[PDB]
Design a protein around this ligand. Structure first.
Ligand SMILES: *C(=O)[C@@H]([C@@H]1N=C(C(=O)O)[C@@H](S[C@@H]2CN[C@H](C(=O)Nc3cccc(C(=O)O)c3)C2)[C@@H]1C)[C@@H](C)O
Lengths: 243, 242
């Protein structure tokens, strides 16, 4: 029942990129997209996988609780922003891949498989190595499936404790005003061709809720801000951002 | 022992503010204040009482859950900002008193009394009527006590489920930045003299956490923003926010 809104395409052509936005009001039963085909196409999740990985980390006890500090061992990491002790929120905010690869390692394949099945997480293919599958492996998930998973998270309906779902929700908050709250997560998947850029999340505005998932083909770093600006312009046209 | 930091008085001086800031790193065992006497003095909590009231409401069942919508009945309310449907977070963040009056009535005197004893909340005096004790009744709490209560909340150590503590915690998020996160709640107690203004909460930056409570006398309504600006300037100067 997802509907196509072809006018949204102008926000993609204005920036010379290919991609999809899916936007649902209230539930995943009222969704619209600029491109019906791509809305259902599955792409490497990259750093958006920190959302399930975090929940799974808490459920399995690998992450002890919300106050867990991920200590840096001092050995060098691929970005300087990652070279420091991090909270769960901090590790999510900076997209600290090494923290999550250690989480995945301790969770292990059999349990990670079990959770991705419970979560109906895309093609649930975690081959490509326990700490790499969402980065250069065979895992793939669509914008539509992202929206469905995030709706279950918002509702505390994933197969995980309410407490753990709440902890991860707080960690994902990226904008806050009295009657406007955004939970969101970016991704940039360099380990696939073409590279994929993601922005997924949900907006609570007054008493309404909107689920969203965006992805695009990324040539390189310079186009990364479009992951937020294109969704922002669509949501503005829909009356979500302003008043 | 809480230490006195006279220096902070400089931020109170230009605006002639009579007030106190309490700021603790990691725990309420490591606190400082500009004014030891005022730090421990108890003031009417006004809208800051929405924090325990929300938790009590959830713990009793009076508040259904995180997703409960508080419908406006169309009858005029004291503030236009309150004349709409509100989520729990909305009701807390716009300080929608009538929503919390109804919650308090449904909680009731016996339960409310017991939870303030469990939370060690100030003087625990709820006389004045069940729906006005924190507005114009006799309940009073100090800045030090606000910090101790907020620390317990942070740590999920109040006598309430971890889930209900977590619900209220997300409801208190007020600033979400890449480097830090702020949970806070304002208050303006117009039902006492002098009028009291509050800002209480905590800040998480890097791997550290700081609890804070600020109050001041409000000589007039134009001085209201000082309830955030003075403690923000102090916490900015120490590196806690920014
Ligand atoms: C995930 O897909 C991927 C990440 N995603 C990235 C991206 O979106 O660019 C990079 S890491 C990313 C780049 N910008 C942020 C950042 O540094 N922000 C930030 C936020 C809060 C605080 C601070 C700070 O205090 O320094 C910084 C992180 C990477 C390619 C994985 C799979 O590689």
């Amino acid at each position: 029942s997802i509907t196509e809104n072809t006018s949204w395409n102008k926000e993609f052509s204005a920036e010379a990129v290919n991609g999809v936005f899916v936007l649902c009001k209230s539930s995943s039963k009222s969704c619209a997209t600029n491109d019906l085909a791509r809305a259902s196409k599955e792409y490497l999740p990259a750093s958006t996988f920190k959302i399930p990985n975090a929940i799974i980390g808490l459920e399995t006890g690998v992450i002890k609780n919300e106050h867990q500090v991920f200590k840096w061992d001092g050995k060098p990491r691929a970005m300087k922003q990652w070279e420091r002790d991090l909270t769960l929120r901090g590790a999510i905010q900076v997209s600290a891949v090494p923290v999550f690869q250690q989480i995945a390692r301790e969770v292990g394949e059999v349990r990670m498989q079990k959770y991705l099945k419970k979560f109906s997480y895309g093609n649930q293919n975690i081959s490509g190595g326990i700490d790499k599958f969402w980065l250069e492996g065979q895992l793939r998930i669509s914008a539509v499936n992202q929206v469905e998973f995030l709706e279950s998270l918002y509702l505390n309906k994933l197969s995980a404790s309410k407490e753990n779902q709440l902890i991860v929700k707080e960690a994902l908050v990226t904008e806050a005003a009295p009657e406007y709250l955004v939970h969101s997560k970016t991704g940039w998947g360099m380990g696939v061709t073409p590279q994929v850029g993601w922005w997924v999340g949900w907006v609570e505005k007054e008493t309404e809720v909107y689920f969203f998932a965006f992805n695009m083909d990324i040539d390189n770093e310079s186009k990364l801000p479009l992951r937020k600006s294109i969704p922002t312009k669509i949501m503005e046209s829909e009356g979500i951002i302003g008043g």
